[PDB]
Symmetry: C5
């Protein structure tokens, strides 16, 4: 992704004007190849009309250009563009909201499952690995950058996400479906076996663990559904025959005709259509928002970095459930042990952020 | 459904332009018969005006065409179209969000309900069948492709979704209502009988199972409500009068009149209305989005494939609760048993996805 | 309600065109009386201008009609209409989402509360009646068709929804407020009395029942709030002044003036304003959507049928908790007892719905 | 609030037309003082132009009026008005959705907490008073009509909402913050003391009570946040410099100039701007929706009546937890004791509401 | 933040007009530097055209100004502005909705964890400090005003939010990631140690505490995600090109040309563009809403005051869990001990707020 939050913290004179000089993941990079084609077509038509066409055909071209001018309307195109990229943006955010994080699960696995020895460490590590395996399995079927990293299920065994026995057992199901639901069923059976044996104290804690697992299952299912069902092709094909039948009209009709005929609209010849290039930029960078956000798991500059979250999770979970169990800092008296109103100091550079407490909107009256 | 997610992963030069050459489930297939009628009417009127009408009646037709030209406005038509297909799209997505999946229920049935023998296997299989039966019963009343597959309740018995005893019992209720609520009541009684007998350990687990069943009941009820209550006919009949009273005005008024009268607008005769055909495509493919999404359980190309999810569920649930109970892969030491920061390898084709961890937006300052 | 879902399943040639010939609950019935008034006023003014007015006053009328022609604008009227009926539609759907159904409660009452004899049957029937009573009490205060059916609280006693003792006790509260909250308090006390006595096994089950009751209480409160607080009168009176100050301008200004003055816009006299009648239909059927959905508990054709859901619930609940307790079909071996991949047959008429399982969007690459 | 739901139940001929003759809480009352100023300014300018100005200055005024006529545009003003009052309306509804009602708490306090004597009655009454106290304390800091009723914390003691001991204890905290969070902490300690002593049977019930209290705490916090943070002043100041720079242009520019100069637009002199007054009404009653809903806890006619809900709650809760505990109507056999399909009678005035049960949309096919 | 709720409680004559004379956090302060540049450029171009340019070049400038006048359109610019600041505003509100408050956690920590001595006080204080530490750690990585207050982790130790032992232990993890997830794992282990030892009575209460902690973990994660992923740069750069390519057209084209050429539009020379300055204000104060709300954790006048909520929380939590445990006011008989319908008095200034109870919308009929 592209992060520019630190550059727009305050509304200064040039906060938004300085973002127009950005190259990576911007308008100038996304619509660089669609501008050359437009310019080449425009100048080819201009040259053909200026020298190739004869005097009699010049009048026909002039009348055709006059005709192809009442069809340049900006309301219908600005409506589809804008009712389309609100749905696209909402889908883009909801796709990120469903990314699984084992943060509410590693806490409970570290706490509830007891025992500080082997067969406790092994059990906790297996329990926390069975969820990262499911997350990797679902992400491999939707993310191109992750599929490139793990092109086959033997690569998972090589990378340590799997085990030889697990890989052998996963192949003995015989079902012609995606196998991203199997580790979630392994987790429940292993947790029940752990409970039968005195490692989990209570059925209350066991039910809490099951409830935590079901949410991750639901989130993975939602990601799979979003990938499977996309915005209908009839809706997608309407916005690109609304923005491609507008610059086509512009090409023949936004042409500097001969100024000897004294038209009410055309009386000056500029070489470059400065006010048409700006319209092209504004009306194409709006469509390239949808063209980029319609699948957030690609290899763009504004696509989710899924190869980093499956690396952070593997380290954080294994450190939380193995090396940080029953190991907490010493318990000591605080600084404000006998103070009823603690007053932490303010630094010199942040003395202007001091404020009084809000006490209701009717306090003054 | 039509899946094109793999073709729009990246925003390249021709990602959206190459989707305009698609036939299955597209504009060219949906409005293929509504274009021939328009063309035939246009050309019939043109021929009649050109030869059938006399000189005196030509002036009347010309004045009528001039009159039928100030009523071609694009804002009121672009507002209803756009405030209608946002409601239609939201309803279309919410209808899929309520599809029942027994994924959170097969896990708990496989885990909690104990016993590895007959009368345990039978109990688990019956418990998991009583939910697929309810899902099939609700889908048969709303999906045309499923009703065609199971036209009568004897077909369910033949297909194995039901049993002779259950089919005989379901007919002895005598209520003139839909019977999609009965298996959910059978499930609770069977689960209570299982608890009374030592197959379920705790009332906590029993309550968890009941809580899981109630959610599926709510989702089935929501699907039934969505099917029962549709968008009001007065709202549907308004958008069909605003897009049919626009091409009617176009037919008489977007006609190439005689160029010997020297009108300010019409001075050239083209045979084919190229810029009217494009408007027709853009303004009719927008209405055919609603025309297609107003009932997602039909036999279109962009309608939910409900005949595949009732086949996947039956296999997956029965494999999870019967052949995968108390059968988990061996417990073994991991690859990173004594490593605090695991570093899974990167493939050669995905070495450009390496990134540093994000450490807050205030890190640099 | 009006159901037309079966007629719009597929996007065929005449799916939306055939709905324009519907009478019940449609435009032609909702704005039948508002069209006669408009036509009568238009023709009266036309006749007065054509014969009553003198030659000198004809010029004044002509100038007034010219003046009342620049105020016919379509954007401001199409904005309020469209930002109003999105709020109206969302409120209309949220009002249905809060309808209480005792489907998650009859299941638990049938399962948890034990005992197959008198004093068990009586207890279960009373527990399930105390919720239908509250639903009827809340619906009687907001639905006209239900108030007409039960104009007084003695009618509830006559109809069997109540009892003489309960009716006598409810009158002995002495509070000048609505009494739709009393059965919910009776339910909790009766359930606690049932638990004290061995009819409910566990406090876990008791708490589950209380949690189920609280949701119905919340839904009834939400229905009461929606009925109590309506869309502000200032917002409602603004859309009624924007659509009544537009046809008023149309009446004087969309008139076929004398064609002897050679105006740039008016040069032909048609008897009937065909393109004004269509505008009237389109701009009045849009307001009559809000006029119909602003209170969904009336006696319209697109209003909720509340008299049927209080009849279905009474039968279904009493059959579930009384005659279907501890009575389930025999437990038998399934058809696919020793088959790992069941393959239910496909009928001849639905052989085109066979599809392969989706296996991720990265499978081909 | 203003309730007109009973007058718009059905879509008859004059349902919406009869609401234009309402005075209380309407357009004519909200914008009564802004119309006199506009009329006075318009007529003063008209008189000055007609008599005070000389012949040479009349031409300058005429040219200025012509210039101030191309800036009367209706799209930019109809966009901000309409994107502002959607946010205002959603905030207005979400502010009511967070009003605390102790209906789910009085039920559980009446049921779970046992004992029918003193020290049980006292405990239940104190527990139910500790929540109404918190609701009153939060409402007093945001509602003007409630602050006027309880201007000081001694008024709460006088009115019975508090006690001398509690008022003395609340003053001994020494924190310079709002004290609307203290009764919620008193509730938990009192409930734990009640459990330690045998008045609450189970820790399950104790946890249920704590869960119920936390929701009310969250709702009160949300109300406080909504009051504290308002719509940004820059957003508010943009809509009122876009509707005040439109009637300013109207004042000089919608003036009936001298008809002796033969302008294409102005050729007739009417005394009163009938079509400008209507525009003023439509464009000012739209802004006065936001002006009224931007703070729903004022003293308007469309503002929440918070002084009645703190009076209903105090009576209902104290009747439920004190006089209605372990006191339920006699248990008797129902009317349909041995009937499987009860058929409640239909009244003569509601015989047209009889309908058949819906049996799926695929039943006919 | 800026609070003006007390000034807009009622819809009086000058409620919204008096907010146009506000300086702090307003239009005049936010766009003060962008107005001087525009004025300087306008007057420089005007002077150059009036004196520097020759007679022949004046005609070229005049024709260029005429050309740059058909590209001043208001619909495309009013659509992006308005579809952008709805997403920005929704994100701004959702960012505040995720602010952690330990209000539901201090209650349970004060109630459930028993013991009134040392090793009970110490345990409760540590448990409540471990959550404020996590909140401070997450806020320090996203808020500039908090980072300025705590530029290093030794400042936290100095300010009392931390301890030497905890600071030493946190440095011994060796993970190159943000460490805002560590106190949440310390909390669970400390709570389990407290349970093992008789300080927490029940596993039910322990599970309740874990459930309460998980919600705060989720909220902190959501804040981190919102900070990490921002609105795409292509979407931000499109609205900035559409409002900077409009005043550029205004500069050359909204110029008072020579009135000796008798143009249909320009016939008068005013020194100051009064109707262009207002347009600039309206169309730039709309963009400065997004420029200000795109990062609500800056140092603006309409940005969240995060330095006050980390000071209020530290005092409130430590007072609730330490000095207010098992210390509640005396239990006494209420004022309405033997009254069934309490009637609290009304003050003289609020006697107009008396209202009758609402009894349904069908009461009158
Ligand atoms: Ca992409
Ligand atoms: Ca369909
Ligand atoms: Ca109605
Ligand atoms: Ca107000
Ligand atoms: Ca900011
Ligand atoms: Cl999380
Ligand atoms: Cl150009
Ligand atoms: Cl699921
Ligand atoms: Cl054409
Ligand atoms: Cl339900
Ligand atoms: Cl007409
Ligand atoms: Cl409630
Ligand atoms: Cl006027
Ligand atoms: Cl809170
Ligand atoms: Cl100007």
């Amino acid at each position: 992704t592209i992060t520019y939050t630190n550059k727009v913290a305050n509304a200064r004179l040039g906060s938004f004007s300085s973002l127009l000089l950005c190259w990576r993941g911007s308008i100038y990079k996304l619509l660089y190849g669609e501008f050359l084609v437009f310019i080449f077509l425009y100048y080819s038509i201009r040259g053909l009309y200026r020298m190739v066409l004869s005097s009699d055909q010049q009048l026909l071209f002039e009348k055709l250009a006059l005709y192809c001018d009442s069809y340049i309307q900006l309301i219908p195109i600005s409506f589809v563009l804008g009712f389309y990229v609100t749905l696209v943006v909402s889908r883009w955010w909801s796709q990120y909201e469903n990314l699984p994080w084992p943060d509410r699960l590693m806490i409970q696995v570290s706490s509830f499952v007891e025992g500080k020895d082997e067969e406790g460490r092994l059990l906790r590590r297996t329990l926390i690995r069975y969820a990262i395996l499911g997350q990797v399995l679902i992400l491999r079927s939707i993310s191109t950058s992750v599929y490139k990293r793990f092109p086959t299920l033997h690569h998972l065994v090589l990378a340590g996400f799997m085990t030889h026995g697990e890989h052998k057992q996963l192949q003995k199901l015989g079902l012609p479906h995606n196998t991203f639901w199997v580790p979630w069923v392994w987790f429940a059976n292993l947790s029940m076996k752990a409970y039968l044996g005195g490692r989990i104290r209570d059925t209350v804690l066991l039910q809490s663990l099951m409830n935590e697992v079901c949410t991750l299952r639901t989130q993975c299912g939602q990601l799979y559904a979003y990938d499977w069902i996309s915005i209908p092709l009839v809706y997608t094909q309407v916005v690109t025959v609304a923005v491609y039948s507008f610059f086509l009209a512009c090409l023949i009709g936004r042409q500097f005709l001969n100024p000897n005929k004294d038209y009410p609209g055309h009386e000056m010849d500029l070489v470059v259509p400065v006010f048409t290039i700006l319209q092209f930029l504004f009306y194409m960078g709006w469509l390239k928002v949808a063209e980029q956000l319609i699948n957030p798991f690609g290899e763009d500059d504004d696509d989710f970095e899924t190869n980093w979250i499956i690396d952070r999770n593997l380290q954080v979970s294994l450190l939380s459930v193995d090396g940080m169990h029953q190991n907490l800092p010493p318990m000591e008296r605080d600084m404000y042990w006998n103070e009823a109103a603690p007053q932490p100091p303010y630094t010199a550079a942040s003395a202007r952020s001091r404020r009084h407490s809000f006490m209701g909107s009717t306090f003054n009256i």
